[PDB]
């Protein structure tokens, strides 16, 4: 009358060697199957096609129904998670026979021979040999210590039923305390015909390390010493938020902890627990943290919490609410003294769940991962060419700084889908090409990666943080005094905010760059980003505002949270003179709200010293007198048009792919003759050169002087004295 | 006690010969619990399509599961049984009569097989259980000759007393070793129209999309055929097949054409039907349904109409069935084994239909889009529509063909339907009102009845984003060849120097400004590249693409960005910027500001477009913002001004061809000097309104006088004043 339906798993304890098949199950369920416990028991383990034969015995009646046994080496073989929703099942045909069972050797170079002593008889003693092989701890092993494992992945035998996905092999061996034509053999990776489910390890997850160290160390802390963090008395966190733009990171991390910790484990289905009757979700809520907090070692993973806990203030949706965010906790304030409990929580974005009072009092702990930087897709590539090995393609290193440099955009979950991709279309362009060739040849290389990234069509491109191309000095024209100046801008408050501790005068933390709109104004600030090598921000000026009012307002909070969380750094604000003007140009009042809320975060009853505000603009006019005041904004830089030197280094710069000595030019009469036009201009005069001389002949190796006189005759200088005279007037009176 | 309820079908395997009409595989237990015969007929009626196509029944070797039977794959496709439909067995039925005549029919052959027969007759009729409606025998070996020959057995003269029966098996009685019934080689036509049986649908049933035919078939017969294939890259293959388009394109058409060519198991769902008042129910059955798909390696799985089940999730909720379902299946699409070789097929509407949460890049990467059909395709459609009516129902030359494709613009293939069907009940209704219930094929398609078919026809397609502009060719060109030289290279440099320009750095200027007169030369223009680009055209309107809701434009701009994009490179075009440009004079609302700012920031902000070229044309060019007018945008700009002597004149000899040159007596060089302050557009009302001129005398005419082409010139104004064209000058001097 029990009625079993569902089952979960649980570690066996005393370890030893037992049955290595123990199946701890209570009489009743024994009884509710209608099958004898001297056999065999399957597990559905909730779809995946996998079913398991195993043999079957009886607890002690002190093992709860709720929980079984399975043993971590068949954990390991099935990859059962130490948690995961598991059923019961009536026996199917037994297996018709083994043949070979061949050792594998993984983690290990192998060449055993002298200390082997005949590991087959430990290893076949269990009778549950598996197919895929099964994986045992060191234990003692003569001398040396170390750890060695082997796995029986590669054999021949084969089963009528294609049905039964794990099928269990016998075993009926001669000795004491020789296979079938000997055993040893291979030293490569697991067999690929039966594609055995292998799906991260730690030498996979690269991309990030300065997150990972720390969510490993905030995630060991209460665990392995919960005695030691409860001494103190300042109780252990129970809340973990993970929280980043889409595509990154997030889901590897929770199954690689859940995989690679042998405790239980807690996981979700996400908004699969809401029903129509709230009894049900509370009944199922309270039952699973029953279960949670009734065995010492638990994990709990909650995926998608905006779904399941909707902002309070945003809507009144009704149903599902606060109130199971409040029962949740509650049940997280109390569950013990010192305990060990971690939960980890990864939501897309925590601007729809309610962090209203979550931040306060329930968790301290904050997880930011951003999109990958070069550094982190040029190691993610690397690793993806790592586990798809040589043996399948060849490309140089060369070539892989390229594409990692080509790709700035991309999202850590755009990479595997061009590898995909180009996988794909190799072939495809293979089968109509070469009519069936062998793959091996056909490899991957460089045109289709070229191709694949060029028709991606990447959606992730629109974010609140615009990671701008990295630049470095060489494309900077400008004069030495400049650089200079933002080098010691740049690095007297990272240098010095020690003595400024003690000075008590702090910084200034106000730059503001007025100038031509030609050049020297945005190029700069990705130069000034890759040499200091700080988090940058780039934010344009329409690109905040927003129909909906308060939503710049929103946008603007939260880009300055997310610089507050990310050290001392810089901010920069690519077009200021759109929202400044208050009076010279009608505008909303949302504008003014705006401004007044900017000037308080700024220099308003509080100082925001990590940070430092630069700005750009067009007109200065446009900047209201109350936020230009002395002690904000005080810098000013003139950053007037170009100069002999810096034109004559931008014109050099563009020449590189052209031949300076088939074109006879000296650099320096092109440079004096083009005196007042800017750095885009003389990119934009380049280019039309460049065409000029490429409409003759379609490609060529050179550009004549003809075609230089013709760009610069056609395209005007378009600027007049009237604004410089009037940036020196602004420029005088401050 | 085992009460079968429902079978499925699975191929023969072994080859062998068997009974390769009546294998029958089926446990006995079930033959023991329906209480009939093994030895004798049985009737599976798949539910439905009465007839029950009654075939002999034997027994299994205890190893053929229940849950599938076996019934030939010869009977199998005559029956229009694909693999994995719903089999319902019931009682057996009353023996057949006799057989009458049995006629062969060549299919897809020029018969004369008289030289390789070698009684034929015999392989095909000594079988059991042989059924008229249609046997089909692969080649196997008959002396030389190799190749494939296949018959068509479909034609008979036999009466039976049920008319329920559609199928009606008769039984067979020969003479012969290792004579019919007076002969059986006869005709060579296709099955008879009588029998109104299904027919399966070919490659040749679809045309006009052969790219895209010929990519989706690649993706889904590289998994299925060489499972191995993908296996040894290990990055798994993908299971991702989205099919999105307008309704009636024929995407669905094509889907079940690719599940007819495949001999594969193949699975169908009603859609919303599995929806049920009990989530757990529901689960339950798509577990079942999986895992019984599944159990044989080689599986479809076909999904329809799936945004009812998968809501976006990104905006507003509802109850019961939610994105839980969505999750589900993504958990169980992304674990049914390493390598596999099962996809999925998913059938949508719309893009954003679909929850874009399903839409993941690492499972979903493949997406097909099937967008209206061209000219091309409309033609191509509409020939092999008339070809396979075959000419004895009708007699139409390719000329009304392509004047019909050229006369449909937003037509689809749902559309060219009702049209065919709407003009054959005309001709009937024309038929029957005026002849008298006359022969129907003496009758047969003419041109007034489809005139008047899609004149009544009110297609609900006018309305849409995506326009295909109707093309023109370079004859109706009227203009000077200093423009055109300029477009060429324009349009032509990045196609054969897109290689150079990634090499030097330049890219393409990629903006090109057509401001003039509004007389002409801009949808000429327009028509003129989009002809010989030969590259994918959108058109989007002025006063269009301006809607009441706010950020309309705006998601609709970004969804004709991006599907230039995606859509290999290629040319955009505007038809009126002089109405979305005015905002500070105009005193336009927000939503005009955001979206130039939101278009200025897409064309050259922190990205580059090198593959699409932007090319605009705008009648009033002083509305457009100082920060849109900057040097490495729109910097190309074209005069385009009134056309000029040589372009009237061109026109006016254009418009006279249907007129008699030498019987008018005009030499086209004095009409086309006194007419010179016209424009293209006012030249043509000038011709239209010096024919009706002409016309109102004495009804048609064969010529045009002089006298009426003075009256026409006189009674109208050229209309166009010399200060416009001096503000023309002033503005292209200062720009
Ligand atoms: N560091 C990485 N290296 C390689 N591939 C990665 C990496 N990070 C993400 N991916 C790719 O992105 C896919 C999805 O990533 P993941 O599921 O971890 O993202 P998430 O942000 O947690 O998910 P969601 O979009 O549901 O919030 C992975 O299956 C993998 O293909
Ligand atoms: N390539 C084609 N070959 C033959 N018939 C076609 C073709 N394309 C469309 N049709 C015709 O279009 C008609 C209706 O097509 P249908 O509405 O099923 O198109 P679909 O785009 O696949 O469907 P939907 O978008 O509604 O799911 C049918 O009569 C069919 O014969």
Redesign the pocket.
Known sequence: FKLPAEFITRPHPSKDHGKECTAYIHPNVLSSLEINPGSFCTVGKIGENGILVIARAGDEEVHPVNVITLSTTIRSVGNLILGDRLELKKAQVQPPYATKVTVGSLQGYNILECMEEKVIQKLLDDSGVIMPGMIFQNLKTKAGDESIDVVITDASDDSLPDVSQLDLNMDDMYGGLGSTHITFSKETQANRKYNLPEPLSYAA?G??DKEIESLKSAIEIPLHQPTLFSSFGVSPPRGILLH?P???????LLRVVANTSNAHVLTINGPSIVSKYLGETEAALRDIFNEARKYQPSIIFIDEIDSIAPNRANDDSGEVESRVVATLLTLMDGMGAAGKVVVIA?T?RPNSVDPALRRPGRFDQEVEIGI?DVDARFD?LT??FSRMSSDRHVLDSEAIKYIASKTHGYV??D???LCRESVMKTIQRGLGTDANIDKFSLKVTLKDVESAMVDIRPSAMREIFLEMPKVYWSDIGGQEELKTKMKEMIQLPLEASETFARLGISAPKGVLLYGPPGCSKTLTAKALATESGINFLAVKGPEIFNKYVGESERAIREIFRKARSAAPSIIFFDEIDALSPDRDGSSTSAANHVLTSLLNEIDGVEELKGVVIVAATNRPDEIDAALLRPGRLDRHIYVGPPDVNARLEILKKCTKKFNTEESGVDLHELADRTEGYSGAEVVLLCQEAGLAAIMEDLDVAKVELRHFEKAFKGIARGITPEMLSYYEEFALRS
């Open positions: 997850v991309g990030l980043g889409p595509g990154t990171g997030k889901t590897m990864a897309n990958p993610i690793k993806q850590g979950a990479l595997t889908a």
